[PDB]
Every structure is written in structure tokens, then in C-alpha cells.
């Protein structure tokens, strides 16, 4: 009796739909469960994403339920919420969600997509009592994917061989590891000095990944098929059990200088969950960066726990 | 254009976007432009569809342009048009159409474009032919979604029906994209065997069963519409199986809006048939013996085509 | 084993290790153990395979073992056994490798295997039903490879006939895995269109051509034989190919050695069938309602394998 | 009308056709001939791989062929070769009567060299053919590479695609470790070194298993075939599929590392052009001299040739 992967979804919005569509594009789980408060969208989802199912690369069964059709899930991922005011409104949203859902008997792994999403991890993290490895924020993977892909282009090769993470909070505080990026073994500051690549010009590369975002928001409304993307991206390093390395949100306890406070850092991914943290020696700028954007967020928290 | 597929997406509602987001979770396509006249939700959602760009399995090169852009296209795919109001005939829907299309494809034309089309706009066959008479093209180059998406549902259930993978099922609808579509029960047949061997041999497989099931099939649209609102992720993954199948010339048989000239007894009209689907296009027209029942309900899908091409084409 | 695929393979000579190097290449098992009392060119074709893992698609965990390893192996896939002499018959050839494959299947169900058995080693019909008899296992949980090449390539040359995909093309070889084996002319169909309705409909497409498309597929291993010496690439394709519908749960029809107990006529032998392959092994029997000449030619084929059995099997 | 993509194999031996049902396997190219003197051979393997056609995850089109059939191909990879310094002498024969038959057929393509010693081979096939220093490639330390990069994600915990480690220098017994820019998610893996206790001596182990796998292979069988075969049709999928891949394939330096005028062994971006850049890691002290001394064997082997 070989494990079927199973990934229940809460909140069929733009998000949701959308990670729901990309699991089923990319094959990434066995079984997806849909459930939302308004019952009839959740449905007409669910029914929309079987129409074409015949055409899916792989099977994947997906079907509209409740909070008890957790029970089995390997995971949770939660897209719901409201779209300091706004952090109260979610804060509460997830108190009964989280209930809910521990209430079905459910014992796998929570992937937070929802903003302020370093802040709800940590909310989540509280209100499951779950062992802090086995509850996961998307962080600012996405922010990093990009940023890794703007330089394969800009120095000419594969992303895969070449190395830069975006870490701290999912916001204006989040910092970019200069000091780490490196291109098939050399680093960034190296090739910078080398030729005339010059210094601003990489510089505006982090100044588009940080507000990405914004800039789609201001022309559309809302941003959703690079969220899901990185949800579907996530859920498949812990489904296929990978070790992936994602700058995901992680809950810290010294690793950079912080504690108890759930920030992006570069974790390693798998089955499990949170596999350990890659631990970069940060510079003196990204040091203080850093802990400025744990401060900020930390500051957040306390008026709630 | 040598080493590199170029798709072109014209009409970004929700059917066009979820096209161009199968398309990128597929890795079908290496470059992909979006045209829509609405600049702020198109620019938008290309924006939005790169910001994710690095987690898809292939490259992929998405672009805001025009019709200019469609010059070096190998697929120009069109899901724009108006979409018929209540109380709306579809005559009176195929007018306001004919004359969007008009416009998107002698522009297309006049860019120097000379690729394939692929038609996914309501009603698509009729659309497909406005396109093949507009368009000046090889009729092989002008190809619409036709019933590809009813067709491998009703054959994916029968797979989940008899047991066995889609692969090794045969099951075809075949007619007009709507409520004359017809299923060939007289060529359905698992792993070679007819169904109606099948029903004939085993009492946990009945008729009623298997006529359900295309019951369902047909009003799957209107039941997810009743719902949600509107339907497209069903669509826009049929338009992304017919897309692989031209670019990656696999010479799938899909039942394509496909121009007849005589076969199975129909002339001048485009409507779903099994074709085979190519890198030039359709490449052959499956003739399937139809019995008796199946030939009247084909000629009469026909016909509900010609009445409404009639009015409007010579 | 629960979020892991294991495959134990029992001989490694040219059939299991091109095997082995398939199911690498394909990224289709977890975990591979080499099974070979020939210890030297095992453990050298084992590290030699391990030498360029990281380069396969999916990580591959390949070693060196016996018997013992088989415990939580999903599938045993045996290619061991001698191969006929010339001047041997084949009755010969079984008493020899009966007694083989007694002591291999018996250490295997000793070491708590509970998995599929796959086998390879000819004649394979034959010691398919051997290893059936010997396991004490359901016979949906043991599988010969049976036609499996010789149909998929009497698939693929029509599809590359009249014009279209494999997946769309349905054609059969059925029988022994050897000189009596027969195709299924009657069911054979293209897009779901009949063989002979094609043939008779269009003058380019004519029998003889069918017909050496056939004597060909037939004498395919015999003159790889003559120019090489041996034949191997083929067969570990087809090993692979089952492997995987198991391993993944496909459901593909494939004509696999399967055991009859009543249908196409023919009752208690393992023979070439079209059957539902899954996790579980056998899940299903395609029954094709043979026309008069492929029933007498099919009784034949398991005639040809009961005279076989019969010496050796109550 | 769409790029068709056509590899050319030379040489039909265990490697050869290894490397030929390797690329059916993975869908790599879309038409492959084999080519070798022994015609029968050469013909029955084409035979044998076509038999499972049908089971390929992609149509490809595998045929036998001639030296004159290598006019169009894309890449044309060669493994023939004979299997003591007089090795060398043998094969830059048997490469010189091959290059100047495929030359002589129109090819314009990328060849892409295996048989050993593979760096001296790799220079010979770019003197006789006299195309650009950045299409005549050759496996170099691709392999023993690889092997280090995934025997270090298990040793560390992480997916291979977030180890960073390469193996340099000339395919053999000076081949060396790029100690100094092996990291590991960005970390250094000296930093990972001392900070835990990962021992030294350990990760150390790990550099000597990879230079005597192919020893070891060879002592109980008596070749390796399956683990080069993979190598050349990673590279061959780097070309064909235009993909801008880091491999340490065998590269001509004018200068890059101390070295000029010399195949050898070091990061080079790989696309459908060939090579198209020479990654330059900052070799640190030890690391410099153990390449200069790689260099300086193979520079003085080439000499009496050339």
C-alpha cells in the first residue's frame, strides 16, 4: 500500500484557484481538496479544474470538502484571509481556521501563503501547536527565484549554477545576500570588479524584485500566478521530499542573531518539513539589515502573544 | 523561429490567461506575447505570469505586444469576441463576432504572420470558418478547439468506467461544438473491444450507465457556469493539449473543428471531427463508418452550422 | 516500502543490465539491488552504473545483493537462466532452466518478498507459469513479458503507416512469445477506423504490406541475432516499459504472459494476452472476440506451450 | 520548418552504444546514426536499439551510416579508438583518418571527444579539423565532477542543485579539487568544516574515491561504459537544448589559469554554440600549482606531436 500525496487547499480565491490550476499543470500531487466559506465558488472550482482533467499530465483526483477532510492531508496550504487593521482581521481568520483544522484530526505540514506571511506563519506556528519544522511560510522564495533567474540571464548562465538569496521579512525590509551570490563558484563582487558589469546596474535588479509586487498590483488589482508558483514549488520540494534549499519562512532561535520570530532564511526542504538552516556568514551591512527586519516584524508580534 | 516555438495569445480574459498559465506550467511553448487592447489588465497579468517565471519546468518569454508582434508566431490563438448575452440568438452573437474577427485577422494577415490558427471563440466552428475565409489560408492552417475538450472527457470516463488507461480507450464526440454534438458508440471500444460487447457480456456495465455519462459530458459547461459563473480552466487546457500537439508535431488524433468538403457526407461547413494534428496543422481527417442513427445526427450537426453560416457567407 | 519503489533484478548479463541502465535512464525505480552469483562483473556493471547517477533524472540508490535484499523489493524482475543451444530443443532448454528458476523463486520467497514477479528468461510463457507454481503466489501477482516488443512494434510500424501516433493506433500480437504468436487483424484499427475498412478504401494501403509488416516484427530478434550475436536492447525496453506501468499505477493494456483459465477458449497456461497492468500486477483481462481463423491459430499458440508444460506440470 | 537535431556517433564499442541507448532513453536528440569500421557491428546495435523503439519517452530516429552521412549533423562524438605511451600514438592515428573523413563530408558542426586520453585527443581533433577552439569539446572531468557534487549533497544534507563543486585539471591522476569555491547553499565548505564536527580527512576521502572509481570499475570488469556514456549525453543535452550549463568539459586556454595553448579540464558554459564562456575561479596557492603542473604534463606529452 504505497503513500498517496495529499494536499488540502483553504481558500479558493485568485490565489488558491490558481495553485490548485498549477498543481494539476504540473502533476505535483496526488489528491487536492478544496474548501472555502463560500461553499458554491469552492464547487464551481472544483468543477471548472475537472473539465480538462483528462488532460492533466498525471491523475490527480481533486474535489470539494470541509475542514474534516484534513484528517489524512499531508498538507495544509491556507490562501485565506482578508485582502495593523488588516493583521487583526487575519489573526482572527486563522484562529478559527487553524482550530478547525486541528479539530479533524490532521497531523502534517501548514504552508502559509496569506500576508503579512512571515507574521501569520508565526500566528499559525501558535494557534496548531505543532513542532515549529512542520509549519512553513512561502517567505520571500519568490522574491529569490527572481532575483536568482535576472542574474543567469544577466551573467549569461544557467540558474542553476548560480547562487543569491533574498532573506528577512516578505516586505520593504527584506535584504539581498550580496555577500553570498555567486556565479558557477565565483562570486558577484569578484566579476563586478573584473569588467565594466557594473555596480547599480546590479543594484536595480534588487530594486525591481522588491517592488514587483506593487507594480502589479497598481495595474491589475491583485497579484496571484507567481504566488501560486511558488506555492506549487514548495509543495512539491516537501511531497517529493527533495532538500531543496527555499527561503522560506522559518522560525529562528540564534541562527542570525534572532530569535523567536518567524523570518525568510534559506531552509532546507523535504518530507519532513524544515530539514535545517543554511547559515550564511552575513557581512556587516546585511547583519544589521537583517536584525532590523527581524526587530520590525518581532514588534508586530508582541501586542498579539 | 528555427529553434524557438512562438505562440501568440490575442483576447487576455480568463480563458486567455489560463491558456497562457497552462502553457507555462507545461513548458509548451518557448515564447509566448499577449495582445489585448485592454493595456492595464494584459500588461498586468504578463507581469504577473513572469514574476514566477524562474519555477517552470522550461524557459519561458512572456510579452505585452500587437498584432506586429504575431509576424514570427508559429500559433496565433484567439479567444477574443463578445460572449452572447440572454435573450441573445446566436446569429446575433456570430454578427458582433465576425466582425471582431474580421479586424484581428486581417491584422494578423498584414504583419506578415504565416502560421497556424487556432480558434477558441463561442461559437468556435463557425469562427474557425470566418477565419479560413478571412484569413486567405491552407484550410489544414486554420484549426479550432472544436469538441477536443467534451471528447477526452467522455474517453477519460469511460477509462474510469471499464478500467483501463485513457491510452488504450477509444471514445469520440464528434459534430457541432454544442447541443448536436454525438458520440460514436459504433467505434467506442476498450482495448480494441466494442462497448457494446462490452455491455452485452456483463451486467455491471450498463447502457443507461454509459448514456449518462454522456448526458453529463454535455452539460458539464452550463452545470460549472450555473456555479462559478463562467468557465475556463477546462477550455484553456484543451487549447494548451492542441497547442503541444501542433508545435511538438505528435500527430495526436483530436476532434478538431476541421473543414469537411464531402466526408461523412457533410460539404463546406468546419466542425469537430478525429483528425490528426501536426506541426503543419491537421495532417489527415479520420473517416469513421458511422451507422445509421450516427449519420443523421452528423448531417443534422452540419446543418445547424449552415443555417448559420448561410446569412453570412456565399 | 511506503514512500519508495524497489526493484531486486536476478541475473546480470546483457538483458539485466541494459535493463538496469533503462530503468536509470527513465528515472522509473527508486532502488535497484543486483542480484548475480557472478560477483566481479556484477559489482563492476553495479558501480559502473552508480559512476554516473548524478547525472540520471531522478536519483537512483543502485547496489550489490542477494537474495536477503529481496524482502522489500515491490518487483523481482529474473532474466537469469541458460539460453537454448543450437541442436537443443526447447524441452531441453526447460528442464534446465525449471530447475534454476526452482531455486532461485524458493530463496526469493524465503527472504519474506511479497511483491510482483516479472520474468524475462525464455522460453518466458513457460517459466512464467513455473514461477507462478513455485511462488504460491495469486497469478495476477506474476507477470512474463510475454509479446510485449513484438506488439508495441507491430503498433509503432503502423502508426508509422498510416499516419498517425501510437496512441491512437490499436494493433495486437497475441499467443506465445515465439514462431506461433499471431497478430489480431481483426481488431486492429486505426483512430478507431478498421484495418481492413482503410485497407480496402484506399489502394495505397495494401496487404502484403500488412502482411510483412508482420513476417518482419516475427523475424526482428533473429536477424539482430545474426549481425550481433545476441539481442538485448529490445527486451530490457520492454522490461522497462512493465516496470513502470506497475511501479506507477498506469493500467496500460499491455500483452503481457498472463494466466488463462477459460478465456479466448484456451485454460490453465500463462500466454500473451492484453491485459490491465497496475500496482497490483494483473488487473484485468481484455477479452477480443477473435474471428475463426485467429481462434484456431490462438489454440494453436497455447497448444505449442501445454506440450511444454505437460512433461513437467501435473 | 523546425530545427531538426542530429548527433553522429563514431565508434560503436561499449561506450558508443551505451551513450546511443542513453539518449533514447532520455529523448535527447532527434536523429542519431552510428557509424563504425566494423560495418556489422555497427549495423546489428542500430538494429537492437530500434527493436524497442516504440518504448522511447521520444520519437527518435536512429539509423546506420557513413562518414559522408555526418554532412548535417549537429554533433558528431567519438568514441572509437584503440583501448606504453604508444597508446597515444595509435589513437592520434586513428582520430587523424577520422576527423579528415568527417571534415571531408561538409560537417560544421561540434565534436564532442571521449576516447582517452581525452584532453590530448580533444587538442589533436581541434588541430586536424580546424575549426573554432570553442566547438571542438571534449569530456574532460564532466564526470568525476558530477560524482563529487552529488557525493558532497549527501554528505552535507542538501539537493545537488544547491552544491557547488568542480574537479579540474587533466582527466587522470593530476586532476585536482577546487577546494577553495566548494560551497554549499552558499555556504564555504571550509566554514562547515570546523564549525561542526563534518571532519576534514572525511570530505578528504570523498576526492579519492572519485579519482580511482574508474580503476575499480576497470578491475572487475574490465571497462567502464555506463557512467562515460551518461557524461557525454549530459553535454550532448547542454548543446543540443542550448542550455548555458557549467560543466567541466575539456576547454583550449589562452591565458585563463596560468595555462595557454592546452585542452584541459575547467568550468566552461555549455550551449548550442559549444563552449561559451571559461568560468575563472580565484585558484588559491595550492590549488594554482596543482593545475600548472596538469598543464604542464599534458603540454609536454603534446609537444613531440605537434
Known amino acids: 500500500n504505497k503513500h498517496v500525496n495529499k494536499v488540502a487547499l483553504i481558500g479558493a480565491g485568485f490565489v488558491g484557484s490558481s495553485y490548485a490550476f498549477a498543481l494539476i499543470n504540473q502533476g505535483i500531487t496526488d489528491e487536492l481538496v478544496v474548501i472555502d466559506v463560500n461553499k458554491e465558488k469552492a464547487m464551481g472550482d472544483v468543477m471548472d479544474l475537472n473539465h480538462g482533467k483528462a488532460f492533466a499530465p498525471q491523475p490527480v483526483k481533486t474535489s470539494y470538502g470541509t475542514y474534516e477532510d484534513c484528517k489524512d492531508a499531508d498538507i495544509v496550504c491556507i490562501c485565506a484571509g482578508a485582502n495593523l487593521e488588516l493583521v487583526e482581521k487575519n489573526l482572527k481568520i486563522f484562529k ?76 520593504d525590509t527584506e535584504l539581498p545576500v550580496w555577500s553570498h551570490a555567486n556565479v558557477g563558484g565565483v562570486p558577484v563582487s569578484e566579476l563586478v570588479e573584473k569588467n565594466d558589469y557594473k555596480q547599480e546596474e546590479l543594484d536595480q535588479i534588487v530594486d525591481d524584485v522588491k517592488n514587483a509586487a506593487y507594480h502589479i498590483i497598481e495595474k491589475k488589482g ?84
Open 96 to 171: 478559527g481556521i487553524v482550530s478547525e483544522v486541528m479539530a479533524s484530526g490532521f497531523d502534517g505540514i501548514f504552508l502559509v501563503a496569506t500576508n503579512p506571511v512571515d507574521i501569520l506563519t508565526y500566528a499559525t506556528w501558535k494557534f496548531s501547536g505543532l513542532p515549529k519544522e512542520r509549519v512553513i511560510g512561502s517567505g520571500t522564495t519568490l522574491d529569490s527565484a527572481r532575483f536568482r533567474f535576472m542574474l543567469s540571464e544577466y551573467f549569461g548562465a544557467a540558474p542553476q549554477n548560480v547562487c543569491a538569496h533574498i532573506i528577512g521579512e516578505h516586505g
Open 222 to 305: 491583485a497579484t496571484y500566478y507567481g504566488v501560486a508558483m511558488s506555492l506549487a514549488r514548495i509543495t512539491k520540494a516537501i511531497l517529493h521530499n527533495e532538500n531543496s534549499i527555499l527561503t522560506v519562512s522559518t522560525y529562528l532561535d540564534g541562527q542570525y542573531g534572532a530569535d523567536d520570530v518567524y523570518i525568510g532564511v534559506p531552509a532546507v526542504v523535504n518530507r519532513g518539513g524544515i530539514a535545517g538552516i543554511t547559515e550564511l556568514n552575513l557581512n556587516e551591512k546585511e547583519k544589521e539589515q537583517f536584525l532590523h527586519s527581524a526587530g520590525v516584524l518581532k514588534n508586530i508580534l508582541k501586542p498579539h502573544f
